[PDB]
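As noted in the main text, all predictions were made from sequence alone. Below is one such record, for Bifunctional protein putA, Proline dehydrogenase (EC 1.5.99.8) (Proline oxidase).
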Amino acid sequence: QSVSRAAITAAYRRPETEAVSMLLEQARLPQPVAEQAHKLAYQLADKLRNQKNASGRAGGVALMCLAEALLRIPDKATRDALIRKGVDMAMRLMGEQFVTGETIAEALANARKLEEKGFRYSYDMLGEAALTAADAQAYMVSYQQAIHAIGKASNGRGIYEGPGISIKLSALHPRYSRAQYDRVMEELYPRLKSLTLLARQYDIGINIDAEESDRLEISLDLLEKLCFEPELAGWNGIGFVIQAYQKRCPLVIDYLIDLATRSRRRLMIRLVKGAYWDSEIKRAQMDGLEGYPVYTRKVYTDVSYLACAKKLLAVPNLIYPQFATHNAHTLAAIYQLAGQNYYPGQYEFQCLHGMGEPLYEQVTGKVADGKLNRPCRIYAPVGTHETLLAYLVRRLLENGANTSFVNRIADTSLPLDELVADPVTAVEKLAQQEGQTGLPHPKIPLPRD
Ligand SMILES: Cc1cc2nc3c(=O)[nH]c(=O)nc-3n(C[C@H](O)[C@H](O)[C@H](O)COP(=O)(O)OP(=O)(O)OC[C@H]3O[C@@H](n4cnc5c(N)ncnc54)[C@H](O)[C@@H]3O)c2cc1C
Ligand code: PRO
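Prediction:
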């Protein structure tokens, strides 16, 4: 193939100057909206930094120990007068903060606390990249069991206010990374269909997570078919992730808008930046192809996310946008771009368990409690230590990258105004300095170079 699908294919690895130049005016926040976003982003970030007055205290150590000792003198007068194992253990130590529970039942029992404050959940049974038939079957069973449990705890609250599930197509088909069209359709699809039908019976959201870029196309074929199942007609609980770090992302949105039209539904669309960037670059560098399927400067991903957010927010009849981010500017800009006259079903935010709660405690909840009154859905990984590895590694990359917001916020030296700097302005600043808009990262030449 269709006009919308062909356009996706042709953007796969489009030159970065070109891609970024095309996104720029689509992402630009109008003057007024830009400054309200700056102001809200600044406040959110400031409050995150200075939680227990960790700024005002920052404004030696030897004297403090002596001063401490003197203050333990009770009477003022007297005071005046005078390899394989270490890796496994490191992974589960760092990983506990990211896991909401070992079993789906323990994860749900712990859901009341934030659900009452207005948070929602999407549970993920940890596991991906099934190698064998037995692995994939076992994932299929863990997903079914999860859907029964979440569905019973949802108890009719529905797709927006109630919990959902997130699934990985790589978990449901052995050797998914290289599987061909015909075998995926014969084997993967019936399983996707079956879980989705089950999610529909309990009226919970079911979201298909996005993985590596060479699986985008097949995920779209699977989604297309799913959306035309007679048994799913009139049901708007199907969710799909799109990754703004991909050059294809805006063309994927055009496709999704048309799909929602043709299949007569509202799609739940989770807009993310993306989790596999280090691997995507390495992959593209090994295949020696004409370009990258992702951007090479982080600020360009920020610009793509804003442009894509506008596209999504423009079609509320077709798309329920789920804006996944821990970046205060991103959050603030979405909040402003969504416009006046918010209603619950317009959009929600999302965050990963162990990363987002502090930012979103300023967001989800009552205006009279100093909150924004916008719902946030926490992504909640569920499983034991043997299913954690890949997810943890991705979190370490995310938390430890010096371009990450969550890394830069903890950097006292970097002033708030730089931390929440408008990405469009940053791209324009780079373009005046370097002589062209959207030049690739200077340390990431094309694969053929
Ligand atoms: C609820 C939730 C669900 C998610 N589901 C998925 C999913 O299904 N699939 C998936 O891939 N991701 C998923 N993610 C996104 C991913 O896990 C990261 O959390 C997300 O990219 C971090 O973005 P941010 O806005 O919080 O942080 P920011 O710091 O603003 O941006 C971080 C990122 O920018 C990108 N980046 C970093 N360096 C560069 C560079 N040099 N050039 C271009 N881009 C760069 C990467 O995407 C990286 O994550 C999910 C995130 C959340 C919160
Ligand atoms: O697996 C990951 O890293 C992303 C984050 C949440 C869901 N998918």
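The radius of gyration is 24 Å. The chain has two domains: 1-59+83-449, 60-82. These features were considered when defining construct boundaries for the mutagenesis experiments described in Section 2.9.
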